Amino acid sequence: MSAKDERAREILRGFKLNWMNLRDAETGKILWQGTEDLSVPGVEHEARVPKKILKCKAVSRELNFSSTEQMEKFRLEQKVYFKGQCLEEWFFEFGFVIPNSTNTWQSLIEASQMMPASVLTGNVIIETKFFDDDLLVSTSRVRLFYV
Ligand SMILES: CCCCCCCN(CC1CCNCC1)S(=O)(=O)CCCCn1nc(C)c2c(C)n(-c3ccc(C)cc3)nc2c1=O
């Protein structure tokens, strides 16, 4: 293959998403805790989160990942699909990743066009594109329910 395909596969085979917390950015209280690897591609993951998260002005997303491979510029492109059409796009950059390292990464998700939980629940899918700089490594998807 292009050998970039092989590098991308190398990075993916050595990557794990170990845990993720979603916090109310006002209090730090944990609204949702996940220990399963919801970055695995080729599946449609599901996350059931408390509907009150929709009333937080901001959510602090704190995750922990491991990577056997070095990355020059680990970053995410995330698309929020509502009823199959892109509603919002998020961009987050981690930067350099030491080979065989385990790293905690905090990002703030900030807010309007806010719809009720009954409308959003089961109709929101987050597509996450995992890049090292300009190299697309993987794409994973999670469907959100607001309970
Ligand atoms: C227009 C908005 C409509 C929809 C609601 C917006 C979403 N809301 C945001 C708040 C903001 C403040 N106003 C209220 C709403 S929300 O419901 O609180 C999201 C909680 C967090 C959503 N989330 N969930 C999971 C499970 C994620 C995973 C697995 N990965 C991931 C990371 C790295 C890799 C490699 C792969 C995947 N990233 C995830 C992620 O971002």
UniProtKB/Swiss-Prot annotation:
InterPro entries the UniProt entry points to: Ig_E-set, PDED_dom, PDED_dom_sf, Rhodop-sen_GMP-Pdiesterase_dsu
Superkingdom of the organism of origin: Eukaryota
Alphabetic keyword roster: Cell projection, cGMP, Ciliopathy, Cytoplasm, Cytoplasmic vesicle, Cytoskeleton, Joubert syndrome, Membrane, Sensory transduction, Vision
Its job: Promotes the release of prenylated target proteins from cellular membranes. Modulates the activity of prenylated or palmitoylated Ras family members by regulating their subcellular location. Required for normal ciliary targeting of farnesylated target proteins, such as INPP5E. Required for RAB28 localization to the cone cell outer segments in the retina. Modulates the subcellular location of target proteins by acting as a GTP specific dissociation inhibitor (GDI). Increases the affinity of ARL3 for GTP by several orders of magnitude.
Protein known as: Retinal rod rhodopsin-sensitive cGMP 3',5'-cyclic phosphodiesterase subunit delta
UniProt topology in membrane: Peripheral membrane protein
Subunit structure: Interacts with the prenylated catalytic subunits of PDE6, an oligomer composed of two catalytic chains (PDE6A and PDE6B) and two inhibitory chains (gamma); has no effect on enzyme activity but promotes the release of the prenylated enzyme from cell membrane. Interacts with prenylated GRK1 and GRK7. Interacts with prenylated Ras family members, including RAP2A and RAP2C. Interacts with prenylated RHEB and NRAS. Interacts with prenylated HRAS and KRAS. Interacts with RAB13 (prenylated form); dissociates RAB13 from membranes. Interacts with prenylated INPP5E.
Family: Belongs to the PDE6D/unc-119 family.
GO biological process terms on file: visual perception
Subcellular location per the Swiss-Prot or TrEMBL entry: Cytoplasm, Cytosol; Cytoplasmic vesicle membrane; Cytoplasm, Cytoskeleton, Cilium basal body
Cross-referenced Pfam families: GMP_PDE_delta
Primary residence: cytoplasm
Gene Ontology CC, one term: cytoskeleton
Disease: Joubert syndrome 22: A disorder presenting with cerebellar ataxia, oculomotor apraxia, hypotonia, neonatal breathing abnormalities and psychomotor delay. Neuroradiologically, it is characterized by cerebellar vermian hypoplasia/aplasia, thickened and reoriented superior cerebellar peduncles, and an abnormally large interpeduncular fossa, giving the appearance of a molar tooth on transaxial slices (molar tooth sign). Additional variable features include retinal dystrophy, renal disease, liver fibrosis, and polydactyly.
Tissue: Widely expressed. Detected in various tissues including spleen, prostate gland, testis, ovary, small intestine, colon, retina, and peripheral blood.
Ranges where the record places region Required for association with membranes: 141-147
GO molecular-function term, one example from the UniProt record: small GTPase binding
